[PDB]
Amino acid sequence: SLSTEATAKIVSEFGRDANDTGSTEVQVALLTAQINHLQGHFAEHKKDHHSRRGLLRMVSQRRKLLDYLKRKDVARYTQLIERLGLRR
Amino acid sequence: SMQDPIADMLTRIRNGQAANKAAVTMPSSKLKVAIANVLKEEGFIEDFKVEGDTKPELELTLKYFQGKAVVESIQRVSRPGLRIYKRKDELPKVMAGLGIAVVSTSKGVMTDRAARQAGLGGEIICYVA
Amino acid sequence: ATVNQLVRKPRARKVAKSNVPALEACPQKRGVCTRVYTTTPKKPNSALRKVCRVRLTNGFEVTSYIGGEGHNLQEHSVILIRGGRVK
RNA sequence: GGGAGAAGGCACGCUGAUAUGUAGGUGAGGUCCCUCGCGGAUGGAGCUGAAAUCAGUCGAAGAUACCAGCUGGCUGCAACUGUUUAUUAAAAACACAGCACUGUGCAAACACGAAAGUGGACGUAUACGGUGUGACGCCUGCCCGGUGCCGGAAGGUUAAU
RNA sequence: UUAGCUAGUAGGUGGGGUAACGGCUCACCUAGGCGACGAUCCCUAGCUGGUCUGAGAGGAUGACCAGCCACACUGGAACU
RNA sequence: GGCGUAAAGCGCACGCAGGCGGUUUGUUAAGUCAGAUGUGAAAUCCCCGGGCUCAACCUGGGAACUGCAUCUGAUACUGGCAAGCUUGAGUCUCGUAGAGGGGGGUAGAAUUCCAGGUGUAGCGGUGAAAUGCGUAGAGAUCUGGAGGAAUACCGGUGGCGAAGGCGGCCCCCUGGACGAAGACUGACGCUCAGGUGCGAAAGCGUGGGGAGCAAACAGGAUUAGAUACCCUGGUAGUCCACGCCGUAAACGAUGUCGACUUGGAGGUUGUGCCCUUGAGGCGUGGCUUCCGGAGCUAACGCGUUAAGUCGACCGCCUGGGGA
RNA sequence: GAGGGCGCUUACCACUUUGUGAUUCAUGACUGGGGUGAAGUCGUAACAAGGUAACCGUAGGGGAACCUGCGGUUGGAUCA
RNA sequence: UUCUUCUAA
């Protein structure tokens, strides 16, 4: 899983305050790095019974945590998905 | 989850009568006070006590008569899934006018018999009997 | 019964049919006798019910009960039916 | 994937215009760079040249000759490309990918060889030999009495000795 | 148990046409147009005031009276 | 109008369109309301009249024609527009419990099989038997070995997962929940047709593996018959790898997310305080079991985890057979 | 001189024809179940522990109800 | 252990 220091850097990456942690920009980037850490676990492990309980729960759980940052702020949404490399 | 504070309010009034409570409290709204300042005036509650700074909380006093309750019925007409807008002629008569119907028109919140004398219709909130 | 479902789909009032379709919404229809015979009824009653197989105006081939007691009916005869089931 | 060129139908010459050569192709002399070359850009003369439209116009007919598929419907059998009775029989026969059984531990099984030896195979059981069946789809029931095969070693039988 | 529909189609420009505007028509561009708020296709049908029932809500219904529409052996076409 | 059992809540989860929306301030005036113009033909109907001797009928006036258009307002609500707030919602921080998940090992009993020692006449099975297995030495007994499958006790009206479900131990990867103090975010929410995924067992496809068990099947009984129940066998199958199927009384026969409403006895899991004065008391959370008040229910029952009181949205029902 | 007439041809198009589909009705040897019987034949599965608890799935078998295997449900009885 | 069936008022 995503370690404490790695989360702390991503907070310090997009820190409006260096203490803010209500920045969805951070939070999008957290599950981004979290499941990119897990893409080596799920390209490895395919249909593992509860793959959606601990595999897709983060399919949708990353997905809808994007979905307000989807409809969040056009001046910043344009900037963020540029930096995060998001396809859409 | 929270689809209405008004239907929350009337049911908290409704369940408090049968529970024989003397004080029903809830977080307050601007529209909540505008209704609660009618039923004291119309004589269906005894006291409301709006308090709270970070978040206003309306605390009511239930009116009981001869041991039993006063609010014999409390309903909801314009629900959030289906709104009700009736003119001044289609204002109802709750329990043949013995009960009251809370209507909000452009002139604030009043009862229907006042709104007939105001001569202007609007949005019927609830039935109180 | 939610009104959104009522918006997306109206209340389908059930459509009823006639039990006497061969008249095709007429009071009486002309017919031609095809076979005149008797028929035993179902269990609670025991009789020989006089009855005739009828070719109609519209080509329908139906059976129709002979009321009363005794008749002068032949095959190839012109009759007239009013309706009503026999139980 | 196909069936399917299914079937079926329409156009077709010539002349002119478009455009006295068009689309295009090729490409000089020029011009500049140039490490200057069996150069690079630019540059377009020249030649070459489809296809289409429009309008005429000739015949009985314009893919005019030569050239160059008869199509459709049902069903048998074999899935198919294949192979064969040289010289009366080309298929339903054979072969076939596929399936199943069986054998075989390598100095393999097996075959040719009096033998030596060789093939197997410079392969090693996802290998090889044999038999049967013959794609694919759905499948594949019962009987070991008989005949074979395999396993058993108690007893009966019994060779040379 | 009707889901895709459309090539004058959809738009433009230009010309033509009609009492009139407009693919009305034509030429040339553009690839649009439409549809799950039911296009498309099939079945049935003249429409409304009204009529009948129902406490109402509604439901059914369109003879007679009206208002409109369509048709005139059938299929066609113009003429005046 | 209804969906616990009388027909009826998808097997669950996800999620778009969709519908729905906390709080507060302005703005807007869209919706909404009010007023006014236009029109809503006549007839008809209604009301008040009149006329035919009345009545039917005719007819005068009125109302009505529930609308639509326009104009003038109105500003409470619902929208539209902006700004806020933090309770909803979501992060950060430390921990907590767990058959939560995959992956790879590893144990120990058992059973089977193989081989051997000992030993002898039965064994096995049933209600009785018999088929069967036995002198070719079984059974039994000990010793050795092999293989597959499941993981005693713990263990629990326990635990976890949305369910389907998950049970030796260890390792690797991985999920979810809860609590605690906080910090932050600013409504970021709910439900969701169509869609997407998961989804018991049996079954299907290739491969593998195959101890036990076991459809079919075979024998033996059994009976009037016995294609059964019982016995002795025994194959697919059960196991694994990867795919298909997508159904189960997939049941709590109760769809999901809110809010309110008497209790008691527990279980499990946190977390404060009080001296823990021992396994104590006072708290405060999460989850779950039984009982049960009001209430509801056709009754049965449910009963703060509602089948009570209300909210939002979806699915479904409409006599039985046919089906 | 223009124009008109007539004919000429062109454009459009009715009648009509060809093929191929689609849809719907009627009919059809034969065949599939369904429902129904005031008396038949065969068995007796379910209702009680219905005399092998019942039923869902799914698979196999079988004149017939059914039987059996796997999994689930209780909408099943029993208890020094 | 075994053990089935009772037409039509």
Side-chain angles (χ1 to χ4, degrees), chain C residues 1-13:
Chain C
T2 302
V3 67
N4 294 114
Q5 295 179 354
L6 294 172
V7 165
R8 295 194 302 274
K9 183 254 182 65
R11 286 285 184 83
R13 277 177 168 86

Side-chain angles (χ1 to χ4, degrees), chain B residues 1-5 7-8 11-12 14-16 18-19 21 27-31 54-56 74 76 79-83 85-89 104-109 119-123:
Chain B
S1 293
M2 295 303 295
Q3 304 296 318
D4 194 7
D8 192 4
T11 304
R12 285 183 181 182
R14 188 182 300 114
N15 296 326
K21 305 300 291 296
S28 177
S29 297
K30 183 173 90 275
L31 187 61
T54 60
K55 48 186 73 175
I74 175 167
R76 178 63 176 273
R79 71 179 188 268
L82 196 279
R83 301 287 184 182
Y85 299 100
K86 300 294 184 183
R87 292 180 63 188
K88 67 177 180 65
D89 298 332
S104 176
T105 69
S106 293
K107 305 287 104 175
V109 176
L120 50 96
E123 183 174 4

Side-chain angles (χ1 to χ4, degrees), chain B residues 58-71:
Chain B
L58 179 62
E59 184 177 1
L60 297 169
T61 301
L62 300 187
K63 190 170 180 174
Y64 288 153
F65 178 72
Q66 293 180 358
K68 66 179 184 179
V70 171
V71 179

Side-chain angles (χ1 to χ4, degrees), chain A residues 1-2 4 7-8 11 16-17 19-24 26-27 30 34 37-38 41-42 44-58 60-61 64-65 67-68 71-72 76:
Chain A
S1 296
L2 191 60
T4 304
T7 55
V11 170
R16 287 89 53 84
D17 300 330
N19 207 165
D20 53 359
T21 189
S23 176
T24 313
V26 176
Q27 298 169 0
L30 287 173
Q34 174 70 48
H37 170 71
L38 263 57
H41 180 71
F42 294 112
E44 177 185 359
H45 301 283
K46 232 131 336 258
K47 12 140 224 328
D48 288 323
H49 263 12
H50 247 179
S51 233
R52 22 257 46 174
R53 247 18 277 132
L55 174 38
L56 301 180
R57 134 118 229 187
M58 283 181 174
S60 180
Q61 186 179 4
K64 296 194 81 68
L65 268 294
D67 288 340
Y68 170 68
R71 168 206 109 240
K72 178 40 209 289
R76 303 174 69 188

